[PDB]
Design a protein around this nucleic acid. Structure first.
Ligand SMILES: [Ca+2]
Ligand SMILES: [Ca+2]
Ligand SMILES: [Ca+2]
Ligand SMILES: [Ca+2]
Ligand SMILES: [Ca+2]
Ligand SMILES: [Ca+2]
Ligand SMILES: [Ca+2]
Ligand SMILES: [Ca+2]
Ligand SMILES: [Ca+2]
Ligand SMILES: [Ca+2]
Ligand SMILES: [Ca+2]
Ligand SMILES: [Ca+2]
Ligand SMILES: [Ca+2]
Lengths: 279, 279
RNA sequence: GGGGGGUGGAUCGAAUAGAUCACACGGACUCUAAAUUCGUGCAGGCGGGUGAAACUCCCGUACUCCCCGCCA
RNA sequence: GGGGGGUGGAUCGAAUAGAUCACACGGACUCUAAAUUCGUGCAGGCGGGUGAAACUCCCGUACUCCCCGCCA
């Protein structure tokens, strides 16, 4: 049966949020597939309208904000201190992330001028607060931020230009309790993101100390790390720590078991994982 | 009496939340001035640490974030649908706000390159989102968004480069309630950020309509507009509507009686309105 | 940085007066009602090319989407 | 686009083992603690000029803060 989905149709069935099943569908001929298509269309373009009617009359907000609040709260309970830094950082700020004019991401930055630039991460903004907060609060110190970071090659099925990040951290963790802490941290988040299935790829080096990631089979959900760290000095940090970076959208892509990420991102083409040109 | 806080002192009193009162305060000599300063400095620099105590063990979030929520949930009651549109718009889009290479706002924006840039407002994302929902949903359509906007030359005691903006709109307002409505919204939001004495300075020209500004006498908290409006043909909008733009930062600037806005804005120099370089 | 789509519901199209499903409206099927079935309305970004004819093919341009490297 | 500030707690400073208030540690006050007093510790981004001497004045650079227009 040598006639699966057309170039277009396949591509149009993502916008509409087809199950991998329906995607991997194929037919004997064409007139049968071209007709099976519009049978789905209605079915999907229908469902869309209903997810909207909910969102219109009870939920009043995108599935993207459902998470933000659910996560912030879940963390407030672990005593984390949610913060909210600026979104523009300086050329100076970056550099401190040993990222000279020749690092793989200095080419990945949205430059506003000589020394302004949209933040590729939350790290520098937290290193910075850490400085003045360490000096002021007895440890251990737990804070976090959810915020929209930017990256300008990033556009694909799991990658966007402006994505929503949750960087959470604990400054001053007993070097023993350091992994038990990540594992914890992580758990807390998924336990509240509604994900149950996850592996914990423990990456390990010497120059790159210990890298950690939160996996669901193939997909990466978070990248974690700890201190002391080689950057720590340029940020005037002399204490053990741990941090974790989740990519929200990424996660919505699993709590909602969808295929591409742009369904529930900052968009004017969707409103709550629902392509908006439907009828 | 003729010795008022030196330049340097006057400023360092700000960061610390010098009350309006104290910021005048003249002196009968410099010695007694210089001393009452350190007197108050200690006072302020110390209530700061107290504040941060609350922050770190009760609230877990700054005063901006807790407002977004108190504010959103409030509109959720009145059946608004909060959206989350992207912060990067296009040159294309901008034009549509009858901006042009001349409009004093074509200079207010941080350009990402040839055609993209950071949203100086929320309109062209709601105007955009408007298009479809007008189709799929019955009027009225109530939707709002709270998000970071951007301005470039904007850097003063009442303005920022990055301000959190709340823009709320209604599509399909009966021409007659077009006005009554604006008040309803206004009164919804303020009574959510607990604000009483408020003045609705109605501006009006036979050219822009009745451009509205939500104000507490001297300060402006919001600026709204209504349609049908001259832009509408460019956003294919053939319908009466009202809209209102708030700067959250400014609300805190009253709610928390403060003196400037950078105290609770996106910042690495503050944190819940408490200047950070304190001991 | 690159590839590939769509022309404000979309998918075919061997350029079928385009057709098909959707989607509004009215009628009948029925007292209802759903299942129908039927009637009709609803279409093609802008420039240039080809052509008998362009929505359909080429070139450009606008927007907007899917995707590859991204590590979220 | 433009002014004015600060040098990682900060404000005076007429440049002179800076000083003053904070802050940390200890005594003591009291039993202890607070308030409080004493003791000590805690200082000056980087380049160049001037100068007997520079943290203090001048030029310049780095970072950060406040302010005018901003219409949030
Ligand atoms: Ca293209
Ligand atoms: Ca029909
Ligand atoms: Ca069409
Ligand atoms: Ca033509
Ligand atoms: Ca086609
Ligand atoms: Ca083309
Ligand atoms: Ca300056
Ligand atoms: Ca001085
Ligand atoms: Ca003591
Ligand atoms: Ca002492
Ligand atoms: Ca000092
Ligand atoms: Ca010198
Ligand atoms: Ca200077």
């Amino acid at each position: 049966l040598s006639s699966f989905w057309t170039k277009v149709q396949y591509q149009r069935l993502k916008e509409l949020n087809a199950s991998g099943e329906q995607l991997e569908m194929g037919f004997s001929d064409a007139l049968s597939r071209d007709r099976a298509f519009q049978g789905i269309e209605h079915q999907l373009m229908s469902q869309g309208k209903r997810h909207l009617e909910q969102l219109r009359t009870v939920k009043h907000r995108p599935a993207l904000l459902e998470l933000e609040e659910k996560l912030a709260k879940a963390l407030h309970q672990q005593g984390f201190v949610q913060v909210v830094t600026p979104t523009i950082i300086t050329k100076s700020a970056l550099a401190k992330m040993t990222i000279g004019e020749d690092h793989p991401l200095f080419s990945q930055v949205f430059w506003l001028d000589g020394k302004k630039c949209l933040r590729p991460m939350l790290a520098p903004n937290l290193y910075t607060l850490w400085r003045e907060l360490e000096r002021l609060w007895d440890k251990p110190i737990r804070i976090f931020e959810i915020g929209t970071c930017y990256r300008k090659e990033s556009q694909g099925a799991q990658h966007l230009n402006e994505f929503t990040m949750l960087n959470l951290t604990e400054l001053g963790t007993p070097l023993e309790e350091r992994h038990q802490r990540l594992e914890d941290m992580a758990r807390w988040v998924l336990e509240a993101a509604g994900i149950r299935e996850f592996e914990l790829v423990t990456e390990s080096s010497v120059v790159y100390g210990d890298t950690v990631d939160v996996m669901k089979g193939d997909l990466e959900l978070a990248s974690g790390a700890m201190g002391p760290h080689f950057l720590d000095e340029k940020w005037e940090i002399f204490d053990p720590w741990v941090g974790l970076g989740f990519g929200l959208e990424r996660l919505l892509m699993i709590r909602e078991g969808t295929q591409h990420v742009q369904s529930m991102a900052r968009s004017l083409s969707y409103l709550d994982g629902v392509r908006l040109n439907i009828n």
